[PDB]
Amino acid sequence: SALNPALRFRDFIQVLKNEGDLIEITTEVDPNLEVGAITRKVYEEKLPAPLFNNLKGASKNLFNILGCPGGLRSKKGNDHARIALHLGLDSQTPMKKIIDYLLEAKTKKPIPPHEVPASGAPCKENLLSGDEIDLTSLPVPLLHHGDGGKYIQTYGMWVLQTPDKSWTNWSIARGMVVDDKHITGLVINPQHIRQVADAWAAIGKGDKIPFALCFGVPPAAILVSSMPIPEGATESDYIGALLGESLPVVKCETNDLMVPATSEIVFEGTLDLNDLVPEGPFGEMHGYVFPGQGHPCPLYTVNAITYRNNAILPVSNPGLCTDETHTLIGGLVSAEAKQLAIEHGVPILDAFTPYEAQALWLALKVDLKKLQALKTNPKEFSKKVGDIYFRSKVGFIIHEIILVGDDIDIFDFRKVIWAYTTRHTPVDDQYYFDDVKAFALAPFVSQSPRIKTLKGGKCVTNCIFPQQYERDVDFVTCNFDGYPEEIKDKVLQNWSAYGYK
Amino acid sequence: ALNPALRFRDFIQVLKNEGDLIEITTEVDPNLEVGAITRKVYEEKLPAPLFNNLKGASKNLFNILGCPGGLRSKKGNDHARIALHLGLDSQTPMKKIIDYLLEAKTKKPIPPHEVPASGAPCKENLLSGDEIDLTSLPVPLLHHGDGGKYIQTYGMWVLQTPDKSWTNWSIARGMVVDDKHITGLVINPQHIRQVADAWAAIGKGDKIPFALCFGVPPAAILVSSMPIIGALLGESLPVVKCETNDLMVPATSEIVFEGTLDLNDLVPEGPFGEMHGYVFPGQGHPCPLYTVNAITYRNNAILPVSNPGLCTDETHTLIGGLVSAEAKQLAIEHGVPILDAFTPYEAQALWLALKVDLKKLQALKTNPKEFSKKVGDIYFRSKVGFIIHEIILVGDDIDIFDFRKVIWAYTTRHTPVDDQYYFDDVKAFALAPFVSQSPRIKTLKGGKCVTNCIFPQQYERDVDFVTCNFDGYPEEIKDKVLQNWSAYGYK
Numbered sequence: 007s008a009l010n011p012a013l014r015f016r017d018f019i020q021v022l023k024n025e026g027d028l029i030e031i032t033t034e035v036d037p038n039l040e041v042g043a044i045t046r047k048v049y050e051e052k053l054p055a056p057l058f059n060n061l062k063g064a065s066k067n068l069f070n071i072l073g074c075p076g077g078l079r080s081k082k083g084n085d086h087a088r089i090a091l092h093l094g095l096d097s098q099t100p101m102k103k104i105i106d107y108l109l110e111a112k113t114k115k116p117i118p119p120h121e122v123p124a125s126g127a128p129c130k131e132n133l134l135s136g137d138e139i140d141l142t143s144l145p146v147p148l149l150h151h152g153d154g155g156k157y158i159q160t161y162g163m164w165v166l167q168t169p170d171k172s173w174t175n176w177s178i179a180r181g182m183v184v185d186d187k188h189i190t191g192l193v194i195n196p197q198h199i200r201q202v203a204d205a206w207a208a209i210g211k212g213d214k215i216p217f218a219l220c221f222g223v224p225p226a227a228i229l230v231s232s233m234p235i236p237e238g239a240t241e242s243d244y245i246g247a248l249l250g251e252s253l254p255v256v257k258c259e260t261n262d263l264m265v266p267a268t269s270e271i272v273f274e275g276t277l278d279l280n281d282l283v284p285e286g287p288f289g290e291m292h293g294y295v296f297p298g299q300g301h302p303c304p305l306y307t308v309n310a311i312t313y314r315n316n317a318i319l320p321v322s323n324p325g326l327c328t329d330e331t332h333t334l335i336g337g338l339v340s341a342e343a344k345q346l347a348i349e350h351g352v353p354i355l356d357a358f359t360p361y362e363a364q365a366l367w368l369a370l371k372v373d374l375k376k377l378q379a380l381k382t383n384p385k386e387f388s389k390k391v392g393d394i395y396f397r398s399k400v401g402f403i404i405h406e407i408i409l410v411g412d413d414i415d416i417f418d419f420r421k422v423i424w425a426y427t428t429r430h431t432p433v434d435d436q437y438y439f440d441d442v443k444a445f446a447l448a449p450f451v452s453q454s455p456r457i458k459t460l461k462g463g464k465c466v467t468n469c470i471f472p473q474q475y476e477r478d479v480d481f482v483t484c485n486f487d488g489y490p491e492e493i494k495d496k497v498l499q500n501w502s503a504y505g506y507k
Numbered sequence: 508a509l510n511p512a513l514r515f516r517d518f519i520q521v522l523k524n525e526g527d528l529i530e531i532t533t534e535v536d537p538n539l540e541v542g543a544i545t546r547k548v549y550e551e552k553l554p555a556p557l558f559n560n561l562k563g564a565s566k567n568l569f570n571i572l573g574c575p576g577g578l579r580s581k582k583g584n585d586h587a588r589i590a591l592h593l594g595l596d597s598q599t600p601m602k603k604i605i606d607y608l609l610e611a612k613t614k615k616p617i618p619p620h621e622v623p624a625s626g627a628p629c630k631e632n633l634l635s636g637d638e639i640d641l642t643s644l645p646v647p648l649l650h651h652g653d654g655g656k657y658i659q660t661y662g663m664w665v666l667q668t669p670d671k672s673w674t675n676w677s678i679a680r681g682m683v684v685d686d687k688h689i690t691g692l693v694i695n696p697q698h699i700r701q702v703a704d705a706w707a708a709i710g711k712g713d714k715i716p717f718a719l720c721f722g723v724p725p726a727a728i729l730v731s732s733m734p735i736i737g738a739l740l741g742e743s744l745p746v747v748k749c750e751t752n753d754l755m756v757p758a759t760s761e762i763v764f765e766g767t768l769d770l771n772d773l774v775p776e777g778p779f780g781e782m783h784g785y786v787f788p789g790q791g792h793p794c795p796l797y798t799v800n801a802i803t804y805r806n807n808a809i810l811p812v813s814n815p816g817l818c819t820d821e822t823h824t825l826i827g828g829l830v831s832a833e834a835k836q837l838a839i840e841h842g843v844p845i846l847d848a849f850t851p852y853e854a855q856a857l858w859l860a861l862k863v864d865l866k867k868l869q870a871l872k873t874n875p876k877e878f879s880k881k882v883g884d885i886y887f888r889s890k891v892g893f894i895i896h897e898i899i900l901v902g903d904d905i906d907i908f909d910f911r912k913v914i915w916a917y918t919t920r921h922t923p924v925d926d927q928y929y930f931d932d933v934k935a936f937a938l939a940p941f942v943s944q945s946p947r948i949k950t951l952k953g954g955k956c957v958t959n960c961i962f963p964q965q966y967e968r969d970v971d972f973v974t975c976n977f978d979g980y981p982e983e984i985k986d987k988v989l990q991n992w993s994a995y996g997y998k
Contacts, residue, residue, distance in 0.1 A: 031994040037978065043988045044995070046977040053997060151981055152973040170828040191987035292919045293995060295853060295973040326915060345861025362911070365919040406923045420853075423914070426852040428783045431941045432956040438924040450922045451914045453962040453970065465923040469945040479789050482652040484780040484816025490651055493539045497547065505546070506553060 012226040019057065019072060019318070021091055027079060035072075036062045036326050037156070041470035042149040042289075046075040052080040053330075055088065057318075061145040067132060068144055069271065072320040075161060075225070076330035080427050088335050092225040093248055101333075102356060105341045108248075112345065117246025119253040119264070127256035127267040129220075132314070134311040135259070140186045141308065149323045150289030152297040155182045157288055161320040161330065162195045162221035163192055165263045166277075168205045168285040168447060170452040173198070175309045176231040176240045181219060181306075182285055188380040189260045189273070190285045190303045193217070195237060203279050205324045214276035216261035221319050222270025224253065228320075234399050241485070257463040270317045274310040280304040281343050291324045291331030291403075293362045294449050315360035336365035341402040343368055353377050362423075366448065368395065368404040369416040374474050383475055388437035388466040395488060396464050403445050407466045411474055413483070429469040436465040512594030512726040514759050515809070521591055527579060535796075536562050537571075537656070537824045537906065538909075540647040542852075545573040545814040546785050552580040555588065557809075561645040564962045567632055567804060568644055569762065573784040574660060574809040575725070576821035579922045589824050593739060594723040601824075601908055602847060613835065617737030619744040619755065622695045627747035627758035629720075634802040635750070640686045641799065649814045650780030652788040657779060661811040661821065662721035662762075663731045664693045668705040673698070676731035681719065681797075682776055689764070689774045690794045693717070693995060696944040703770050714767030716752035717797060721810050722761025733829040750801045754998050763809045765801040772796040782815045782822035783855045787942050789905050818852035826894070827856035833891040834859055839929055844868050849907045851897070851916075857939060859886065859895040860907040865965050879928040879957035894936050898957040900963055904974070918962035927956040 011018035022028040044056055056073040058078060064070070065427035076092070078085045087097035090104055097106070124130040144158035159181025160375050167174045175198075181191040206215045223231075226248045228242055245253050254267035260274045285303035289295040319369055322330040336359035347354035353376035359365045370391065377387070388409065410416065414425045430436070440462040444451050448463070456463055471479045482488050486497075511518035524527040535541060535558050536818050544556055546552060558571040576592070578585045587597035590604050599607070624630040646656035659681025667674045675698070681691040694702060706712045724744065730736050745758035751765045775791035813821040827850030838845035844867035850856050861882065868878070879900065886892035906912045917931050923928070931953035935942050939954070947954055973979050977988075 015864050017661070031995045033994050033996075035995075036996060039984045040987065043977060043980045043984045046980070046990075047988060050977055056995070148975060149977070150975055151984075203602060211780075289973070289975040293975045294919070295975060297971050297973065312913060323975075325979075326911075360755070362914050364915065366918050367796075406918075420817075422851050424855065427857050427897075428940045431945065431947070431954045432958075433924060433927050433929040434954060435941065436927075444703070449919045449962070451924065453964065454922065456922070463922045463925060467923075471940070473944065479787075480789075481785050481940075483651060484650055484784045484786060484814075486543060486550055488651070488816075489539060489543045489546070491545050493651075497540060499541045500533055503530045503533045504535075504556065505533075 010094060013223040013224050013227060013251070015270060015318070015320070016090055017395050018225045018241040019320045022055055022088070022199040025087070025097060027087065028057055029054045030057045030059055032060050034062055037145040037238070039148055039151060041071060041073065041147040041321070042323050045321070046325060047322070049077050049329050050073045050326070052078045052085065056324075063143070067315055067317050069313070070316065070318045071145075072318050073148065073323070073328070075320045076322070078328050078333065078336045083154070086333065087402070089337065092229045094226070101358070102295040105337070105344060109340075109345055110339045111247050112244070112248035117249070118240045118254050119246065119255045121264065122254045122256055122267050125254060127254070128314045129265065129267060129269040129272050129312050130256065131315050132313050133259065135309065139182050139308055139311055141189065146183050147321060149321070150325070151264030152295035153288050154284065154286045154300050154471065155184070157182050158189060158319075159191060159219060160322040161228060161304075161325070162219060163223055163228060164219065165218035165265055166193060166202065166204055166215070167263060169209060170205065173201060173239050174226075175237050177237070178228070178232050180288055184283055184305065188283070188306055189219075189306045189308060191306065192281050192303055194286070198237060199279060203352070213278050213280065216263060217275060217277050218261070218265050219273035220265050220269040222317070224249070224268060225265045227253065227266055229334065229338070230475060232334050234342050234402065236399065245476065255372040259312060265393050271311065271313040271319060273308050274312070275306055275308040277304055277306050281305045289325055290447050291335065292366070292447060293326040293447050296452065299452070315469045320452045321360060327364060329368070332359070332361040332365050336361065339365070339368065339400055339403060343370070343395065346394060346398060346400055346412070352394070353380070355412055356416055359420050360419050362419045365403060366405045367408055368401065368406070369408045369410060369413060369422055372409055372411055372470060374411050374470070374478070378476060379476075384435065384468040384470070384472055385437060387475070388468050392437060392439050392464070392466040396439050402443060403444060405448055405464050408469055409466065410469045425469050426467070430467050435468045436470070439464045459473050510594060511591040513724050513742065515722040515725060515811070517577050518725045519589055519809070521554055521597075521646065522588070525587070525597060527587065529554050530557045530559055532560050532842060534560050534562060537645040537647040539648055539651060541571060541573065542814050543811070545812070546816060549572045549577050549814070549820045550817070551587070552578045552720065563643065563645040565638075566862070567806055569804070570807065570809045571645075571647070574820070575811045576813070576824045578819050578824065583772050586824065589828060592729045592914070601849070605828065605835060608829070608832045609836055611739050611816040614738045617740070617743050619737060619746045620754070622745045622747055624747060627745070627755065627925070628805045629758060629763050630747065632803060633750065633804050634661070635800065637801060639799055641683050641689065642686050642742040645665060645931060646683050647812060648949070649772065650680045650786045650816070652786040653779050654682065654775065654777045657681065658683050659691060659719060660812070660813040660815075662719060663723055663726060663728060663925050665718035665720065665756055666694065666702065667754055668702060669709055673701055673865055676727070678728070680731045680779055684774055684796065687717070688797055689719075689776075689799060690774050691796050692796070694775070699770070713769055713771070714798070715770070716754060717766060717768050718752070718754040718756050719764035720756050720762070721758040722808070723757045724759060726991070727757055731806055732825050734833050750803060762802065762804040762810060762946070764799050765803070766797055766799040767823070768795055768797050770795045780814070780816055781938055782826065783857070783940050784817040787943070789889055811977070818855060821851040823850070823856050825854065829854070830859070830891050830894065834861070835979050836888065837885060837889060837891060843882065844871070846903055849908055851907070851910050851913050853910045856894055857896045858899055858993045859892065859897070860901060861898045862905060862907050862912055863902055863961060865902050865969070869963070869967060875926070875959040875961070875963055876928060878966070879959050883957040885929060887930050891932060894938075896936060896939055896955045899960055900957065901960045916960050920962060921958050926959045928959070929953070932956045948982050
């Protein structure tokens with residue numbers, strides 16, 4: 007069995023089918039709204055991922071849709087299976103050990119990618135170019151009611167570079183179909199616009215910055231591309247470490263951008279940063295579409311499309327928990343949050359973004375013994391923690407950091423909400439930050455005047471009893487698991503003898 | 508016929524009829540085993556246990572009914588045990604139970620009638636004086652770390668002044684001190700203003716007569732646990748005089764303790780695992796000593812117990828649920844456009860969610876700060892908001908009885924700190940762990956806020972948004988997908 011789910015997108019789909027986690031839908035499904043409704047029901051009931059093989063309006067090769075590639079399974083012993091398969095791990099690997107694996111791979115010999123010819127690249131099996139490109143003829147889904155348009159890019163990656171190739175970015179920004187030959191998306195953050203636009207303007211290409219957009223990439227590549235590290239690095243060398251081998255890449259037909267060789271679909275074209283078009287709105291990670299709330303975005307012209315036979319388009323349909331914006335985007339913030347704590351010496355056992363908080367919360371599980379050795383206090387520790395996370399790219403999406411002690415399983419929201427509500431004084435145990443960069447997608451930000459400042463609106467909430475900063479505070483948790491072991495063993499042994507099923 | 512609101516044993520019978528009761532003849536230790544069994548029944552929403560074979564129990568003293576206010580697994584009647592306390596259909600949702608308690612505040616109080624001792628089942632047996640040994644009863648040690656065995660967790664105290672102008676039914680916890688004494692904080696320091704002096708005027712300030720009843724009519728245990736009976740019943744409550752004092756107790760009570768109280772003979776009470784999920788081991792807090800002089804009880808008496816802890820138990824379904832009913836009544840009294848009020852159990856009865864009619868809110872011509880201060884002033888300076896440390900304002904699209912929607916609106920619709928309006932001069936709940944484990948336990952002031960989870964523009968005009976779940980899709984799309992769910996290939 008030469009299946010490698012981390013290296014090949016189709017091996018990933020095959021393992022899902024082998025483990026009974028894939029339903030191949032041959033019923034005709036409408037890309038308008040139906041695909042979105044089906045994926046939401048699969049997300050929220052934690053059902054097998056759908057593979058739409060009979061979309062309305064699809065040609066023979068363009069395309070099929072893989073829904074819920076990062077959704078959760080119902081069986082808790084492997085609820086994070088699809089996430090683990092992105093890295094080639096056992097599907098029973100819990101999320102805590104998936105995060106620890108990502109950190110242990112940062113210490114590995116990075117393997118750079120290698121270039122393969124077009125004949126050795128499955129993404130080159132077909133080619134559309136110029137006037138034979140009609141994006142409005144593709145079965146692109148209208149995912150949420152209220153979306154400003156059909157969103158082709160929800161689970162692929164953009165590729166952008168400077169001419170000198172010193173700056174290279176793999177982005178996961180959303181991409182909306184504008185018309186027959188144009189898409190749009192916010193791929194270059196305002197911080198990098200001058201660097202990249204001036205560089206291409208030097209060669210008379212400032213109004214046509216080459217780009218590539220790839221779908222169905224190796225699942226390890228879409229995972230790392232969704233990981234919060236500096237924009238301006240593919241970190242494909244780190245992808246190779248996770249893969250244990252070199253990532254095969256191939257040259258675009260119309261530019262010198264390198265794309266994964268086993269991609270399902272590859273878009274090619276140029277970008278005009280001065281040609282602005284309305285983008286969105288789009289249903290997002292916090293569970294909202296706000297109809298009518300679009301914003302100008304640079305226009306991307308699509309000059310070439312290369313795609314595999316029987317191409318498959320993975321889609322993510324964001325909304326309420328739990329979808330990819332929580333397991334993947336939130337889960338990788340958790341991994342970098344844990345790494346950041348190790349670099350600054352913060353005694354953090356584990357870090358996690360509870361999905362019920364729509365990836366707006368970052369729970370930090372504090373080693374209380376080491377915290378007491380630091381001889382600090384809630385105000386001094388909360389400020390330091392917030393200064394580290396809210397002034398880093400890792401904490402950009404996070405608007406509230408929760409500090410809990412080492413008795414709280416932060417991956418279990420029943421325990422998180424209990425420690426949150428019972429161990430922090432409202433307001434008084436919240437250390438506010440008014441001068442940190444705010445997340446524009448946060449509905450309390452976008453629906454407030456703070457959407458025009460993008461500053462503040464974040465706090466570090468101490469849910470550790472104040473004396474626990476100095477000494478152990480003894481308390482017994484009043485649930486079944488809180489009883490002595492001999493009591494729990496006796497009750498479970500006699501549970502049927504009592505009369506319970 | 509069966510009346511679960513009027514008779515504790517009709518209540519048990521309906522639970523048995525609805526498959527919601529397991530009669531345990533297996534030997535169960537009152538030491539920790541009863542508590543561990545009840546917690547597992549709480550947390551897995553299993554049928555309520557009826558312990559008929561406890562270590563140390565005599566024939567008549569006693570059996571234990573566990574989880575009388577716990578939830579059922581099937582959501583269609585998850586609040587059935589709470590509805591049965593009032594005599595409502597078991598499938599009555601918690602929203603309608605609250606509305607029923609409100610409709611009952613508009614009906615005439617029916618005074619109780621006295622019945623002779625031979626007509627009261629609680630008089631079927633008598634223990635008095637030297638025959639009383641409370642350490643021989645199978646009293647449970649409910650939580651590991653509790654300061655002692657707690658006999659009073661789901662019963663009611665009865666206190667009165669000699670003039671009987673003041674009478675009170677209390678649900679304060681009661682702990683066994685020794686063979687003849689129990690203890691508890693049954694009277695709040697507000698009303699000691701008139702009970703010690705009144706009994707001292709007769710020479711009995713050193714021994715205030717009390718009665719402690721267990722297995723009372725379930726409507727009685729619900730009104731005394733409510734932050735304000737025969738009106739709810741539709742009938743006159745049958746009561747009977749105590750053996751050693753003039754206190755009137757419910758005639759159908761399972762067990763009745765009688766004796767005297769000394770507000771000066773203070774004794775360590777607690778600790779005890781409570782509504783927020785904690786017991787903090789250590790010395791107790793001084794509480795007045797209660798001498799037990801007489802015990803009357805039915806044949807085959809049953810002692811209902813509550814084992815507080817994490818959600819969900821009686822301290823969340825009843826205490827919080829009745830705070831919710833009074834919270835709604837407060838809103839109608841002050842003209843606050845509240846559609847529904849509820850205390851999410853996942854917040855351990857520390858949160859009070861208010862569902863705001865947005866159209867009526869817009870007619871008020873107000874703003875988040877002005878509205879939150881008004882709401883906090885009304886609720887945090889009332890007895891109903893004493894246990895509530897955070898009030899949450901949400902719009903009319905949120906099911907506040909569904910915590911998935913509450914935590915979604917909470918995390919996504921309020922700016923941390925900036926959308927929280929703090930109250931530093933209100934009374935704090937000393938039981939709250941963030942209060943008791945902080946210097947605020949010496950002040951009991953502040954530590955509360957009203958969190959506005961309504962988008963600021965919604966105070967002026969409608970804010971259009973689509974909820975990004977399956978239920979947020981248009982009806983025709985949702986029907987299409989559900990019709991075809993099996994044809995797609997899904998189970």
